[PDB]
Ligand binder design. Structure first.
Ligand code: HEM
Length: 153
């Protein structure tokens, strides 16, 4: 878990994302999809968008990026008290979408990349530490539910 000073840093960095969640969201998905093409195949609506310029030209992708980051924002503001919010997500991603925990690792790394790409020199070493912890926590609680369900990979 995190200290309160650590949570205040992640909510301070999240205020930068909130200035434009769709712009941040589309960059995160693109990072993900271009870096790990196997992840795009899980998306029936977007698997035909194989290159960055195709991805960029779809408002449907940008809206999906908005759904993702708005969900995550909600969870971060719970400061770790997020069992009611994470359970549904865990369930759907394991039993419906069949998303291995490794893809959650990929998106967590994608977020960090995009914060440094969109705010160079503005994402401090301390901020990076706190954000990393918050994403690990998120991932580790989802891993716990995955084990319960025996979602093997
Ligand atoms: C920060 C991590 C993520 C969050 C907050 C998130 C959130 C969401 C939400 C809120 C939905 C809609 C409701 C649902 O079906 O639960 C959804 C759907 C979905 N997610 Fe995620 N997700 C995340 C990561 C991922 C990753 C890493 C993948 C795959 C590589 C993935 C694949 C999907 C798919 C395929 C759908 C259904 C798509 C559709 O409606 O067209 N998710 N996700």
């Amino acid at each position: 878990g995190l200290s309160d000073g650590e949570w205040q840093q992640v909510l301070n960095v999240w205020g930068k994302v909130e200035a434009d969640i769709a712009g941040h969201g589309q960059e995160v998905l693109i990072r993900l999809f271009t870096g790990h093409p196997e992840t795009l195949e899980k998306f029936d609506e977007f698997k035909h968008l194989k290159t960055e310029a195709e991805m960029k030209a779809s408002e449907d992708l940008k809206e999906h990026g908005t759904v993702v980051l708005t969900a995550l924002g909600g969870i971060l503001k719970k400061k770790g008290h997020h069992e009611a919010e994470l359970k549904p997500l865990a369930q759907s991603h394991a039993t419906k979408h069949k998303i291995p925990i490794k893809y959650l690792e990929f998106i967590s790394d994608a977020i960090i990349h995009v914060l440094h790409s969109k705010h160079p020199g503005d994402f401090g070493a301390d901020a990076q530490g706190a954000m990393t912890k918050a994403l690990e926590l998120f991932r580790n609680d989802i891993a716990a539910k995955y084990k319960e369900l025996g979602f093997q990979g």
